[PDB]
Ligand binder design. Sequence first.
Ligand SMILES: [Zn+2]
Ligand SMILES: [Zn+2]
Lengths: 172, 172
Amino acid sequence: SVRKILRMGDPILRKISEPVTEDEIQTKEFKKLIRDMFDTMRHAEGVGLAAPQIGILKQIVVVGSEDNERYPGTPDVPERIILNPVITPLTKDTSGFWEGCLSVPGMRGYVERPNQIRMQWMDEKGNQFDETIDGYKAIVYQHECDHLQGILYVDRLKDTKLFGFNETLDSS
Amino acid sequence: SVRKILRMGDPILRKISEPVTEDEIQTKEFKKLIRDMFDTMRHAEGVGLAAPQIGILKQIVVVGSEDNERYPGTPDVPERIILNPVITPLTKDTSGFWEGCLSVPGMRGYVERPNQIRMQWMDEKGNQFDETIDGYKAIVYQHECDHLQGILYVDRLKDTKLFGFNETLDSS
Ligand SMILES: [Zn+2]
Ligand SMILES: [Zn+2]
């Protein structure tokens, strides 16, 4: 089921999320949440969604693309469940990108994030990963993980001048 | 007549406005612009409006309140035409305020501006003023004059965490 997505301004989006436990990921409630998050993300044409965005302060993230219409020229992102993620930049190099966020509807802002990162995480089966990630995916993960730290992309704008409403940015 | 208000993202809002000449303020075109700006500002329930906001890069500003519904507990602002304004802060003291902007629809951001300023300006009749301004009016003038310098209130946010969508901020 689709859950309501919280908008910037809701203090929940600025709070820190609690990590999920191995016991937790086996409960029906957890499974139902993941299902709703995917429904919610897909319906909103999102490429990622963090639990906080739907009111749950838990380190739960879902990603997944396939011809995303909100971010036109980006590569698809395979569906994954990212739990308790921890990202560490591996480079000072950045690949600027005009980010958007389901919690900041109608806008885009230019953000420069490290283009190569290390991410440690756990999936829905309790498997642990520790991989190097780059490209678009690296941007998505940093964006999603920021949500778990109560961080929104507007907090990382390179320049408030490079920020605006979609329809206007598109016409300019 | 009501003119379309430009949204953040339109590069015009970041350009600098040209000062208006004494000859200029006597033309019908100028008079028509002032009329439209007042219509535009009133229709949008604004307390101020700068020419840039409607696509004109000229140092022309109009203000005016009367039970403003967008900014609930604020004192009315008498209608005035402010041309070629120049503001100089007279204090380091600030009176934080959750500002909005007709060019950034649906949002509010906490901004701290000097609460006492000196403003030099010219009205529609070519009269020159040099007064000390404070209170809400001082906030409005700095906000409006920023527009003439290609500055939006999002550029002066005290903290990106104190920024969000109206309906959400209101419920929180
Ligand atoms: Zn987001
Ligand atoms: Zn404004």
